[PDB]
Amino acid sequence: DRVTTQTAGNTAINTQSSLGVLCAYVEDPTKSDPPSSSTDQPTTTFTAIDRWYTGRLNSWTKAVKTFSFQAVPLPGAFLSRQGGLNGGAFTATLHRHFLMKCGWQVQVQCNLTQFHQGALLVAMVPETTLDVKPDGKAKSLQELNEEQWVEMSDDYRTGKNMPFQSLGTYYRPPNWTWGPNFINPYQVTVFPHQILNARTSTSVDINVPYIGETPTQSSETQNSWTLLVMVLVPLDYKEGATTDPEITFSVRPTSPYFNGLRNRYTAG
Amino acid sequence: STDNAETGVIEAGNTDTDFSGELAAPGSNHTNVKFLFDRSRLLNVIKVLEKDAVFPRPFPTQEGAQQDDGYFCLLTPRPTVASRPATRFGLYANPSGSGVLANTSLDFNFYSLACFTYFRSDLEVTVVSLEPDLEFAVGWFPSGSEYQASSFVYDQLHVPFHFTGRTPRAFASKGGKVSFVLPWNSVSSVLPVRWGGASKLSSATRGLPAHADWGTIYAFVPRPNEKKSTAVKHVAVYIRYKNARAWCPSMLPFRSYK
Amino acid sequence: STDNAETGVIEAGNTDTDFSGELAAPGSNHTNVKFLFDRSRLLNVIKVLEKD
Amino acid sequence: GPIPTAPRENSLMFLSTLPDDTVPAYGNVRTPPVNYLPGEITDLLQLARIPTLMAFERVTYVPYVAVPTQFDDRPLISFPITLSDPVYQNTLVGAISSNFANYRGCIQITLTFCGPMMARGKFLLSYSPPNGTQPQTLSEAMQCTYSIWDIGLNSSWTFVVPYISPSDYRETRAITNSVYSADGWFSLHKLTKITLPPDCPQSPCILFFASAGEDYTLRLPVDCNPSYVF
Amino acid sequence: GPIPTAPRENSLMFLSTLPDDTVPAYGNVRTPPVNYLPGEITDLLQLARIPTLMAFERVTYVPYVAVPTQFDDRPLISFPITLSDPVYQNTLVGAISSNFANYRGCIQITLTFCGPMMARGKFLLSYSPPNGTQPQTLSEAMQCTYSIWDIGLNSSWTFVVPYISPSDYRETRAITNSVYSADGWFSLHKLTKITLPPDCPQSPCILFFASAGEDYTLRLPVDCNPSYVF
Amino acid sequence: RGNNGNMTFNYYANTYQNSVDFSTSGILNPLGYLK
Amino acid sequence: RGNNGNMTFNYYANTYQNSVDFSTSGILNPLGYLK
Amino acid sequence: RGNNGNMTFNYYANTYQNSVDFSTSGILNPLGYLK
């Protein structure tokens, strides 16, 4: 009846105005079986990682144009400490294994009031590469404080700026005009999503199961799911009201598994 | 009818909900995914080998390296360049200047109806000649292998090794056609239409899958090395998915507005 | 696991013998001798007779 | 003894669409199980029946429409009903339909009001079958099929375009405006002006969604257009 | 009357791997019995599951490794796990695997101590899944999967490399070090120095064997490399 | 099933005509649920 | 058995298709035993 | 029926050989009546 409270481990979250919980593809997204591509003893969930982890995004401002977006690669967020996120036990255990698989639960929060106008779209895009710079290297924490909100242009629309394999000098460089990771703004509502606007609610909750091309993926590189936020109607408010609303989100892993124990990972 | 679109789930209705009327009959089921994709189509055009070949080197290749280009074709809907998997489709809008021109390919229909994320299916291949009264053959090897490059001497006549091997080789009569089907042999369970992982643990290129294909194909003339002709020849390759399946929705290309 | 290789006969094991784990499924039987050798291949090249 | 037979005139022909199989080469292969992947798609209608955002011109394109403050009798916005029309171009219904030749069933439209919670107003939605000239006033609009939608607690309102055609099935592209391709117009009318309290932003915005109906159906596949790559 | 039929596009084609027979020419032949020959082989796995000797460099190759007397923290010996690696080249497992494309199951390693009966010592065996850099010290080795083996009455000790892979089946050759070809490293550590009584030879030697596991499996034949003849 | 017209006779065996997944030991349903 | 796809029909007789040995009047078993 | 001589065997299925009308839910008779 618009009041709900979600509990897990030693943490609990509530809301004074809810719209429901969206289950992605199945009746019970939590149910899952151990992987069949490894024969060692796996490591199921323990009570110290059944939690909600919270972080902070950049603030929404009226100067933002339409279809500008922000992205958050789920398994990569912990590893890169984006937006101040820190997993503690989950991060420590993820840094000490070779393989990992798990679903997710996410929720976003905003604090608009009845005197504001605007709308935000929140969706979970699978198998995306919005977190990588055109040169092919992951964005540093300094770049986010400059590109507050990612712009939208024909390059993103057509996937013409994807990661690039240098072709050497024996050939002659061609003209690149299309790629498989394009983004089509008008069709983003295909993925599991909820629409957030000033007049109706202040939070959105989505539940998602595991997906991958193999039963399990490498810990340090898998990027199957990604969180997306996009602007549909630019913000506007009467002069004198509260400005620059804040945004926050929380995440929870479900039915994890691990395999291939080893020492702390180190790049080389 | 009153409803809330913010919930994400909206129940489809009919004319009778708000007005007087009735629902229409089913009709036909031509939208079935299995029935839609079982149709042959052109994939690529390649030359015909007349001697032992040298497989192209990896992409960081500098100038001056000797190899054979445009003789091998990959079996995969994804973009490719220089007989190796790629990530961005290419196009030469100014055919001039130095440098070798890179072969390219793509499956226009498949990516025009690529509404999902993962795919799996068998595949049937066919080849056709583009020259009058030509004799040729076609060879194949599975995903994750390589082409042997050497020859043997019989009666002082060199014979390339690709004549023999325990992986299929087929011959056609004058003006004939070659046809056969292949299984799904990649290590991965499904073929990713779009990907965002990395294969190597470091120095990798994100979004470039390693084994998203069925195999590799090439054509050659059944004659010894001593009969290298003076004119190039070409053939055309046709593929046809069989018993297809899809697994997760996605979005379609962006049709630009003039 | 302790064993003596000098006896010639050694019993094949699995992952579970000394660690926690389980055995894998069979898979396919492409190693069968009868199925392996039934494939054509080149043997020799010879000339064509035009007289006795 | 040999069975005597005579091949027909159609022999050695290669037909792409032939409904039959061919000879195997490398059989006896066994593949990994795929029980672990959820959400298998069985028919593309499952995707055709998901709403998506349309587009309009702000003169250079946006999905929403801004309600003005001036007073005039023309329709606020009106677009034809033809799947090849630009407005449906990027929506899933249009994008999928462009790969076929015929269709049936009822199209569906949805709207959502994203203005301040304190606003109040009413709107009129109408659908006009084909005529010599399209409607241009409320008096004319009232006579056709129409409905009244009022701003309240709930934000969205769905509208269904009935399938009224002189023949079963209809063409999905309009080379010329025969009665079998074009099927009238849709238009939106502002019945009453919006009321807002002092110190609130003006000119609220409204949003559109388009999707297939319950009894929608396609037929007769056709080859696709590759111009997008350029 | 003649049965009318139309041959397909694939006619008069010669396919080496076709799964069917042909016409006989000289039938009705009867051959001697072969009941007297024992030990018929039914599957080549029977031979793949027999241990054999590996090889290393003495700098010019020997199957054993000599235990030094100096003290250092580096692994005594370490080689990768990739069937195309030289160490497995001449062993039966590698030699047979080079003729196929995929594999499953658990590999097996065995050792045997051939030193004087009066010696005593202990060794540590570890297996490290893939990482940015390979292990280089006992502290790191202890964390991975490992076991302790001590010299006693019995001479040999078997070790099993678990099959831990991100996908079913794996490639049997490494054109490039994708996660589907290389699968980490194996290394041996001398936990304690060897103790010998006076007037005994120093630097004992240790021996290696490699074989397939219980649940090993191959798949997808491929043509072989004839370079050995030269 | 599919774009296959024959309904009476099959020459080759199933395991040679098609690929199979090795074992281990109506109206369209909707996608996306709310509770 | 073997790399043979047909499973329904055989035209020629067995003694003409194959050679036979004239009479006189599952899991893999191991090779090499110890007692 | 018609100019069709075969009366024993049909290879392809009916729905692929012919077109069909989807459902909805002797001596010659004369044309033109008087009452």
Method by which the model was determined = cryo-EM
All domains in chain D, ordered by first residue:
1-230 (2.60.120.20)
Shortest distance, CA H16 to any CA of chain B (angstroms): 13
- Residue in B38, B184, B249 closest to F2 by CB: B38
G31 touches chain E (CB under 8 A): yes
Cβ density class B68-102: b for 16+ within 10 Å, e for less: bbbbbbbbbbbbbbbbbbbbbbbeeeeeeeeeeeb
**H or E segment and range at residue E170:** strand E170-171
Residue written as token pair 């290129």: B205
> What CA–CA distance (Å, rounded) separates D194 from B51?
80
Q: Cβ separation of F34 and A192 shorter than 8 Å?
A: no
> What CA–CA distance (Å, rounded) separates D158 from A2?
24
- Residue in E16, E51, E157 closest to C39 by CB: E16
Residue pairs between chains A and C whose CB atoms are closer than 8 Å: 13
Chains that touch H (3 or more CB pairs under 8 A): B, F
Q: Which residues, including other chains, have CB under 8 Å from residue G32's CB and lie 6 or more apart? A: C8, C9
Q: Cβ separation of F24 and C28 shorter than 8 Å?
A: no
Q: Cβ separation of E20 and G5 shorter than 8 Å?
A: yes
Closest C-alpha among A71, A88, A87 to residue A138: A71
Shortest distance, CA D28 to any CA of chain C (angstroms): 8
Residue pairs between chains F and H whose CB atoms are closer than 8 Å: 10
In the three-class reduction of DSSP (H, G, I as helix; E, B as strand; rest coil), residue D6 is classed as strand
- Record the resolution, in angstroms: 3.4
> What CA–CA distance (Å, rounded) separates D131 from B91?
47
Chains that touch E (3 or more CB pairs under 8 A): A, B, C, D, G
Closest C-alpha among E76, E54, E75 to residue E64: E54
Strands (E), chain B: 2-3, 41-47, 73-74, 80-81, 84-85, 89-91, 104-105, 118-129, 137-142, 151-154, 157-160, 169-171, 178-182, 191-192, 215-220, 234-246
Q: Measuring CA to CA, how many Å separate B86 from each of A217, B187, C42, E176?
A: 22, 19, 36, 16
Residues of chain D positioned with their CB less than 8 A from the CB of E6: 7-8, 10-11
Record: fold of A1-268? Jelly Rolls (2.60.120)
Q: Where are the domains of chain A?
A: 1-268
CATH number at residue B208: 2.60.120.20
Residue F25's closest chain C neighbor by CA? C25
Residue written as token pair 């089913």: B26
Q: Answer yes or no: are the C-beta atoms of D172 and D89 closer than 8 Å.
A: no
Tokens, residue A86: 């820190």
Its domain, for residue B228, covers 1-258
Residue written as token pair 């399946």: B245
Q: Answer yes or no: are the C-beta atoms of E215 and C24 closer than 8 Å.
A: yes
Q: Answer yes or no: are the C-beta atoms of B184 and B243 closer than 8 Å.
A: no
- Residue in A39, A262, A265 closest to E106 by CB: A39
> What CA–CA distance (Å, rounded) separates E200 from B30?
86
Broken C–N links (> 2.5 Å) in chain A, after residues: none
Q: Answer yes or no: are the C-beta atoms of E189 and E89 closer than 8 Å.
A: no
Q: Cβ separation of D19 and F28 shorter than 8 Å?
A: no
Residue E148 CB burial class (10 angstroms; 0-12, 13-18, ≥19): exposed
Total domains present in chain B: 1
> What CA–CA distance (Å, rounded) separates D41 from F29?
10
- Residue in F17, F21, F28 closest to D31 by CB: F21
Do B and C make contact via 3 or more CB pairs under 8 A? The reply is: yes
- Residue in E30, E42, E46 closest to G20 by CB: E30
Residue B162's closest chain C neighbor by CA? C42
Q: Answer yes or no: are the C-beta atoms of A130 and A48 closer than 8 Å.
A: no
